[PDB]
Enzyme design. Structure first.
Site, PDB file in Angstrom:
ATOM      1  N   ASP A 181       0.855  -1.213   0.000  1.00  0.00           N
ATOM      2  CA  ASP A 181       0.000   0.000   0.000  1.00  0.00           C
ATOM      3  C   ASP A 181       0.888   1.260   0.000  1.00  0.00           C
ATOM      4  O   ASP A 181       0.513   2.182  -0.707  1.00  0.00           O
ATOM      5  CB  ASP A 181      -0.955   0.037   1.207  1.00  0.00           C
ATOM      6  N   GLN A 218       6.513   7.623 -10.719  1.00  0.00           N
ATOM      7  CA  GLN A 218       5.815   8.720  -9.964  1.00  0.00           C
ATOM      8  C   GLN A 218       6.654   9.236  -8.775  1.00  0.00           C
ATOM      9  O   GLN A 218       6.322  10.352  -8.271  1.00  0.00           O
ATOM     10  CB  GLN A 218       4.483   8.227  -9.376  1.00  0.00           C
ATOM     11  N   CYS A 264      -2.383   0.171 -13.506  1.00  0.00           N
ATOM     12  CA  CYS A 264      -2.432   0.204 -12.023  1.00  0.00           C
ATOM     13  C   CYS A 264      -3.632   1.081 -11.663  1.00  0.00           C
ATOM     14  O   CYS A 264      -4.677   0.923 -12.352  1.00  0.00           O
ATOM     15  CB  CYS A 264      -1.079   0.648 -11.466  1.00  0.00           C
ATOM     16  N   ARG A 299       3.462   2.208 -11.036  1.00  0.00           N
ATOM     17  CA  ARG A 299       3.772   0.752 -11.152  1.00  0.00           C
ATOM     18  C   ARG A 299       3.800   0.308 -12.621  1.00  0.00           C
ATOM     19  O   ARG A 299       4.716  -0.474 -13.026  1.00  0.00           O
ATOM     20  CB  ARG A 299       2.761  -0.082 -10.380  1.00  0.00           C
ATOM     21  N   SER A 300       2.841   0.747 -13.397  1.00  0.00           N
ATOM     22  CA  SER A 300       2.753   0.464 -14.862  1.00  0.00           C
ATOM     23  C   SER A 300       4.032   0.895 -15.585  1.00  0.00           C
ATOM     24  O   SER A 300       4.538   0.129 -16.451  1.00  0.00           O
ATOM     25  CB  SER A 300       1.545   1.166 -15.449  1.00  0.00           C
TER      26      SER A 300
END
Ligand code: JP4
EC number: 3.1.3.48
Length: 284
Positions: free
Chosen positions: A181, A262, A215, A221-222
């Site tokens: 998370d 990110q 994601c 994450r992508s």
């Protein structure tokens, strides 16, 4: 400069935030005018994450051709990816229309439906064999065929039927279920295993349309998934694997979708994954 040495030099100096901001400053800026049209406000999950006009995926319909999805085309590596947001309640039918029209064989999902107590994407696939899903707006039917649950990921077999022509195709769903998370995984071992399972399936291969990767926003994450895959493929193709510059590959990919990677922690994790993955690519 061997990236493994560049890595230790950034870590010892603690300059991850400085490298990351240099990427953000040099990144491409292209128009996203279709994404910002008022008719499309409920087709966007995040106001600040839009596909560029030049690289956006078009839906094959005259009504409204818009989806929050981009085609990342890597010319030297000979790989293509579609990066997209997690589908919304009113875009689940658009999502499967895109998979159908683009001839994709695989969908790669890097998030859970709920994270941090909030919904990160719609429940867009069926959970029981005998309870299929029909998308009336796009005229598609989706059935769960089988499910293989492992410790770090789940692979599902699904049947997508075009109800207009009664053609059917097998789609593989690769669901990475253990990204934490907060932060990034401590080791890239389970992420690399997952990547090699997607490769083994044929989902990334030129005989099929591009893999669909998502994601929640389709950039973080992508971005890590496509950056690691492309860098390891370039290390196998080139005469000098030391020439692969991960920062330059990331800026090339950012010509096709904004914001890929990110955080400074996601950038460091991408380096770790490529460095550890190379110790297979170079003959082990
Ligand atoms: O390939 C068999 C299969 C397995 C699982 C889901 C769908 C299918 N097919 C694809 C081709 O034929 C029609 C449905």
């Amino acid at each position: 400069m061997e990236m493994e040495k560049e890595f230790e030099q950034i870590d010892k100096s603690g300059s991850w935030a400085a490298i990351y901001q240099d990427i953000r400053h040099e990144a491409s800026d292209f128009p996203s005018r279709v994404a910002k049209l008022p008719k499309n406000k409920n087709r966007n999950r995040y106001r600040d994450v839009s596909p560029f006009d030049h690289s956006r995926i078009k839906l094959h319909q005259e009504d409204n051709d818009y989806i929050n999805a981009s085609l990342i085309k890597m010319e030297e590596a000979q790989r293509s990816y579609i990066l997209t947001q997690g589908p919304l309640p009113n875009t689940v039918g658009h999502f499967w229309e895109m998979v159908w029209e683009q001839k994709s064989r695989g969908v790669v999902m890097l998030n859970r439906v709920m994270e941090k107590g909030s919904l990160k994407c719609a429940q867009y696939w069926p959970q029981k064999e005998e309870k299929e899903m029909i998308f009336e707006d796009t005229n598609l039917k989706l059935t769960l065929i089988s499910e293989d649950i492992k410790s770090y990921y789940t692979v599902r077999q699904l049947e997508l039927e075009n109800l207009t022509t009664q053609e059917t195709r097998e789609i593989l769903h690769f669901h990475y279920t253990t990204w934490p998370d907060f932060g990034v995984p401590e080791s890239p071992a389970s992420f690399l295993n997952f990547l090699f399972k997607v490769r083994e399936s044929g989902s990334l291969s030129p005989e099929h349309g591009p893999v669909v990767v998502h994601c929640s926003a389709g950039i973080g994450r992508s971005g890590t998934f496509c950056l690691a895959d492309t860098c390891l493929l370039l290390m196998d193709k080139r005469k000098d694997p030391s020439s692969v510059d991960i920062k330059k590959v990331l800026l090339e990919m950012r010509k096709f979708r904004m914001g890929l990677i990110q955080t400074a922690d996601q950038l460091r994790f991408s380096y770790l994954a490529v460095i550890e993955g190379a110790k297979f690519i170079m003959g082990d």
